[PDB]
Amino acid sequence: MELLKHLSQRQYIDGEWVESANKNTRDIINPYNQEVIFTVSEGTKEDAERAILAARRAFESGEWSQETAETRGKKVRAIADKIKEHREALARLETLDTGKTLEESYADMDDIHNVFMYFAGLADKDGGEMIDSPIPDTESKIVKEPVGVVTQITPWNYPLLQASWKIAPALATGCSLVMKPSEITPLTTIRVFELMEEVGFPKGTINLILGAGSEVGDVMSGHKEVDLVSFTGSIETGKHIMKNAANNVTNIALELGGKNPNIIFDDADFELAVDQALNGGYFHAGQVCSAGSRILVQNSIKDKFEQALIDRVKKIKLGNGFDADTEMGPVISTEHRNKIESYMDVAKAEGATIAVGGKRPDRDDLKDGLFFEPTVITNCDTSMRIVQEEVFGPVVTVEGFETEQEAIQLANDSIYGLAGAVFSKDIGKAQRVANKLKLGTVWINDFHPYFAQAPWGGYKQSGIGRELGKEGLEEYLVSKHILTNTNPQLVNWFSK
């Protein structure tokens, strides 16, 4: 609330903070108490178009795209340093806007600093290749250029974190960008734009559009001046975005959700597996792309595991993200909580058991917030909607498996392929399983870790492309083969 008195309420287009063309606004809510905490501009499709045209003009001017990579790196580093400088206020703003614990928000800010620092350091480390040409008297080189004008659409769960994954490489490579954060969580994205403006970028290089205005998304994914659309969010919206991008054969990078398996063998460190099953299921109330919502446990220890998990779930502390004792905050919005609630009905109707949770808590200090109890669903199977579909809430399912081969078959039996884990003290076995899982990231005896040094993304319906790592940077580059004939001679194919 302190920081909010100085935070911008506007969009940032072509070097200026500007309101919506029609003066529309949106009230931003704190999910802990459903109170309005801020009011921001709700931009129009014409605003989005203007931002894209500004990004294109800036790209063509070359002020950023032709800046030295070393200098671009120094600027990205300056953003990183600002994130660290404002770590406390940023973490508080993120907890206020998204509801997650302040400790989780601090962790995000540490990661965000590291993301910008990594890409700053990567900016000037390539440039392309020299090719030994198969044609005598020619020089062949591949030059890597910025892809161009990029549109970036981020989700509500980790707004600034996901923004950093897109902004850092775009700026390091010399692109121009237009970003639109989730309409319900724009606060830390507005703040990072203020911080980037303090660092200084050429007019139009960076643009922030706010809202969920009519056709705003369609303009960001379907405009002819866009070279890459990068979207993180729901599968249905991602598919729509990809179909729109097709209208101009535009590159797409998508990170959609997952149905992430947490595979626990009977020779896992049992108390570790229980601890990490809770962590996988319930960090940020399960509102994580890579949440471990699908637990697969070996039959021999399944009963022991379920009882241990359930007993721990009953003790999870719900409350205000600002209170140090809180272990799990509320879910993000009324609409999202309703969707979670509707999945409980689906689960029961198809024959699954709600072993614990599965409703809103009654406690007085939680009544005004968007809370939902941490939930464990048992007696289910792979045919069920509750197992196959991403609920994106504080909910896990538990299925048993007999053998290593069955664990792999079940884990791969989904439309998704983002991340997962294998818990076993037999590292050779864990490695065998990891090699067979169709997942972008596999953890052995861990759950959740990601970092700027390694690419992240999904097989199958979890996405297209990668974020983070050298591969993440590559989404923002395009290759050009320049072939010079150093002794050109007439071909004389056509008669003289």
Add this chain to the structure above:
Amino acid sequence: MELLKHLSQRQYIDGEWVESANKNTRDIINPYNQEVIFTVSEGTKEDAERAILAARRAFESGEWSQETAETRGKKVRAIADKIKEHREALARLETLDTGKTLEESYADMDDIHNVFMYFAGLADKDGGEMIDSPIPDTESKIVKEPVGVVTQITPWNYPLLQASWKIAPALATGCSLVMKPSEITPLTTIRVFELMEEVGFPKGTINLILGAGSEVGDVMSGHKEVDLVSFTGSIETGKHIMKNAANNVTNIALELGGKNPNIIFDDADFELAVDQALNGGYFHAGQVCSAGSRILVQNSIKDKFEQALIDRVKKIKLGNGFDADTEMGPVISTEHRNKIESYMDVAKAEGATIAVGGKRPDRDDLKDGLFFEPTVITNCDTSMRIVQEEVFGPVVTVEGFETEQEAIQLANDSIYGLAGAVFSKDIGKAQRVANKLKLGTVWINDFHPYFAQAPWGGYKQSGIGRELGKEGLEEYLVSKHILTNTNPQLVNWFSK
């Protein structure tokens, strides 16, 4: 006609040569005389589905996907050697099916051998990376795996050449593939499948579907078991394919056409520029993705250039591709010639001049074939359909430019971005221009060269992704981050 008596007429699905499920067939035509030369199976959508399921079963069996990269390379090399062994018959078959000169077909076969040889040698050279992890007591590695099941759709202009650009990296990386060549030019693709069978691949690893059956394309682009759709062809079909691929968030690699500029400065080697303008415009009767259909010539030499080009165009020798004196063969089909013809009407109506050509030739030996005269269109400008749209025939437009800046502006003023050239003895100038052109390939003082060592593909509406080179191989790989916690400890976030 000799080779045709032993050539298969069937599809190749799951290790067997099989007819269409409905026994339908298609007559294949020789464009030189419009005679039926062969009759092949015309497959159904159910055939395509069966091939895809076979490819998936084969992929999951691991017989090819878990074969050593070195051994996969040896097999791809064996295909390369077969291409060379059968060079003469393959070249003849390609000229028979597509109409281009036998000399052009020989060049194709030399290129095809080199494409398979390049990928054979690349197969075992990069399995991923070790990452220095930012988390203590963890090991981080990125493993590159085959992307999975791939569908491959090739065009009629260079059937076997374009097939090799797709097959070679798919097999080198360990993917399973389903290929469908253009319905009007299947002959050399059938033959290469016979040759691959001789080398030996596990059942289902390679599949050939033939036809343009109802919903065949839709199944190949929209099936849930496909991990990558790779399509080379027309922009309208490519967009449709991408939209269908979106239904399962499937990776797409597209190479659509271009409106490829041939930029000739007043300080070019003039006779070289004239020679290469002819080559750019009229190889394969202009039916080249990268044909130099859009000549941009400096105003100072434009009159001289037009006269020199026109005088040469009048001498181009049309005829049978099998006759050694032929310099340009027919176009591919009645439908395609009609499309080219309709553009002549469009050009005149919008105010351009048909300086030479622009009709079917009258000569008696050309009357039965699908010939169209090499054509030069003058007095045109960037606003015109004839300049903006890909005609894909033996037709060039000529526009003038005043300055280097105007040449760049005009060259980039199209929806495409595949390839182009800059002719100037001032290499520094040519490099400045090359750096500003939004094209996947730029030639300086040359026109047409491509090779397996360097990536090929388009900016903007010319495509998504790359073929050839290391980047071409990468389309057929997927990255997996395996993170092992080597000293796992309880996090104890959730109370005990």
Add this chain to the structure above:
Amino acid sequence: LKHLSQRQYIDGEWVESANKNTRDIINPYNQEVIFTVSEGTKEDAERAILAARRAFESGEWSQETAETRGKKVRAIADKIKEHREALARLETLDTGKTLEESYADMDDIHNVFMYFAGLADKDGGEMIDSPIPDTESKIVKEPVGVVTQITPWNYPLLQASWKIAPALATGCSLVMKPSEITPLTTIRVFELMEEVGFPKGTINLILGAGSEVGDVMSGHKEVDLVSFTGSIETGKHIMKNAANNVTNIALELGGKNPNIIFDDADFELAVDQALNGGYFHAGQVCSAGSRILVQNSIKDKFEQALIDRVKKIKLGNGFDADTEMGPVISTEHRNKIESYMDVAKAEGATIAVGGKRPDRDDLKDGLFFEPTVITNCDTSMRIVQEEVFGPVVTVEGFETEQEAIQLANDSIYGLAGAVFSKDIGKAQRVANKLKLGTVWINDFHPYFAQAPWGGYKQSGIGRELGKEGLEEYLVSKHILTNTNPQLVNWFSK
């Protein structure tokens, strides 16, 4: 042998030694002379180097396209496979090892040439995003130049391939000298390369151990890289000579390679692989597992099992199907191995089995030495620290993982080693702490063209095989173009 060349190959011609001297080549199985070859002079070596320089400067190979160089290297690979049987037989005849081991070599050799053939045209350098506005910066990779290559007697053609393949793929000119006692397969491979066809002077073969031949090959001013595989003493001398012209050196010297067996290893696997590590090629392997380190809890069991198996090892003619271990290479080498037995006993170690020449009648004429196990020894002993390079292993116990690592690293060497344990996590921890170029987990011996091979510490400098191996034969050039040059005007006008 009736058709094999007896000469050196210099500047496109098979030629005798300048002084007509020859050397008799021996089969270690029966000590019979099997062939007679030219014994070259230092002047022959100088002529070869000058021919290699002239060929390099002509550009006929160095400026050939990388793709075409790869095709030629592939053609050599194919000739190896075509002549696999005869090459394997020549290698067994010359070196004494089993025909099965020689076949394995020829498969590896084919694969080495095939790997480098495929690599030849895959990386010409990089484009650098220059920090100076209006400049273009690129790094071009060129062949390093003229290279001299000196190979050992244990795996003559194998070690030759590791050097020849990258040199030819990158466009270098080379002068090779195989071990004076084992030239046969190297002569043959030169015949095969000549059939493929290379410009005159690109490849040259010097034969012998003539006075100063080695010195010329390591110290000549026209050499850009000296690549030597052999003994530590000779390697050091070669490096010192190379210094006279600041010449790049690549060295692979021996090792004291540890074979670490934990009490939770697959016991019969560990015994099997301890035998393999110790006795393949009668232990005449740079990476032989001569130093067994076994956990104390299973040490007695392990020693008894190992010793009982060693007593059954079948010695004989490498051509006989039942032979498991052939003879050692020469009288001098066997004498050196014999002298180490004396050293071992004098410093207090026990010769548990073996430690002498076998008595059997069919082995009496050959250079055989019994597979030997030395027990009750420790890290202070010469028998543990020094590379014996014979069919001899030592056995030391360790208590903990930390002690195994300490002992394993307690040598001047750093080539290769193994860790046997069913606990893969533990094996990985140990592997990370061993100062060794190659570490095997639950295996012993494997190497391949796809991965670099070489030593930490006194085991060498540089790497062979893999992309790193290729890089020894390249040099980087930074070409920086100022595209808008302006006067600096630092100095007064």
Add this chain to the structure above:
Amino acid sequence: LKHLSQRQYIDGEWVESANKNTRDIINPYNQEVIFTVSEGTKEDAERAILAARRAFESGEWSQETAETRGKKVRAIADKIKEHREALARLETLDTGKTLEESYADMDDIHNVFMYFAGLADKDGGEMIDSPIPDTESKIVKEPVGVVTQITPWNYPLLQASWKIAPALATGCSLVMKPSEITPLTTIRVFELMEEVGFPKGTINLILGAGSEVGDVMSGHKEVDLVSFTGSIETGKHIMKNAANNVTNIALELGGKNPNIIFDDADFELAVDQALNGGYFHAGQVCSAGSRILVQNSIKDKFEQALIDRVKKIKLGNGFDADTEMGPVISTEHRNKIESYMDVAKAEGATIAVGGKRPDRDDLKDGLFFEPTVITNCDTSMRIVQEEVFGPVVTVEGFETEQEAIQLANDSIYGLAGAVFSKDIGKAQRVANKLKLGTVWINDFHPYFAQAPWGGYKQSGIGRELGKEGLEEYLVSKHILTNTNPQLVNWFSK
């Protein structure tokens, strides 16, 4: 200077020489003693190496995350920028070059540390697709280990940064010894690194005579890499000493760098850059353009223009803004330069201008030597072939592109050179044929952290700067895991 340390830095402590010996440091502008520092012993050097080894083995820096190591290297970069003024002044005081040149050095140094900071966490090694079924193959890149670093007097802190930055980024422990005559900025950077904070023994600074501690730094068994920048004679000695333990060497020695000026060069640009190439830092630059090669048709015009400009070069105190060229480094060095003038005249060359100490009163107390142009010389002469390393250039003519290339490559060196021509295609053709680590087209002198720097032939071994520079400080380990180990059963059961 009143607050600058006078001591060595060994194992986390500032310490005097074991024998309390000291050395007086001189300012070449006036030959006045400016500071007195410890003159260490060979035992001090040994103690530093052993401390570096202990620190390496503790893993406090070598097992720190690459990301964290990068942050520390970045912190050093920031300290350099913070203390830019004082560092530049100290460098000018110690070495004599202009303050403006010293500022340029400090900006470069900041960028060198920043580059390597950003590179620290960007590799780690490779995953290999193994040719053996049921095996996992990976190459892990580890710090090479303990490194000794010996730097020259011409650009003390610049050359120190090229060595320190990659060593620290990769996780090595280092022992550095700056030139005995120019230790000031190196002492200062160690004070700054100490403020950033590194584990005890990770960084060590030895001060004094190459003749006392040099052999220990190049010949100690605990060293894994010796990195030396300096004279050819010393570099060779160092390499021979390193051979005693088969130790990796990286050497950057001088050059005889050609400045090739075609008749179609931008003439006034070529004159400007010829002066810059010849006379920055009084020609005391490893890559100084001492060998001018000019096309015959413009040679007379060029010589007249160059000579006329050389007469106007302003000599003086590096702290005075009008100074364009400072003094040479020492009495011994100036004497060596003077002796070359005698050599040049005796072999028939012409001293067209300069060739002696200046007479002006304000220059008499300093180690000044006039900028010199030597004409009428040829490639057979010592004055053309040998590196004088002073404010001296030779001028030779050439007729054709082929002759320019032949002459340019006709030296024992191969560090750097330039080609001036408006015909870029021609310049590129020439650049491709010059045996030089760096070739500038229409420029002279530029280097940067993003691109590797080093010499062909006798100019060195290895590279500094760029990704290749980082690689000198890494070692490859192939870890091969057999994931389904089976008995081989070679030996009888």
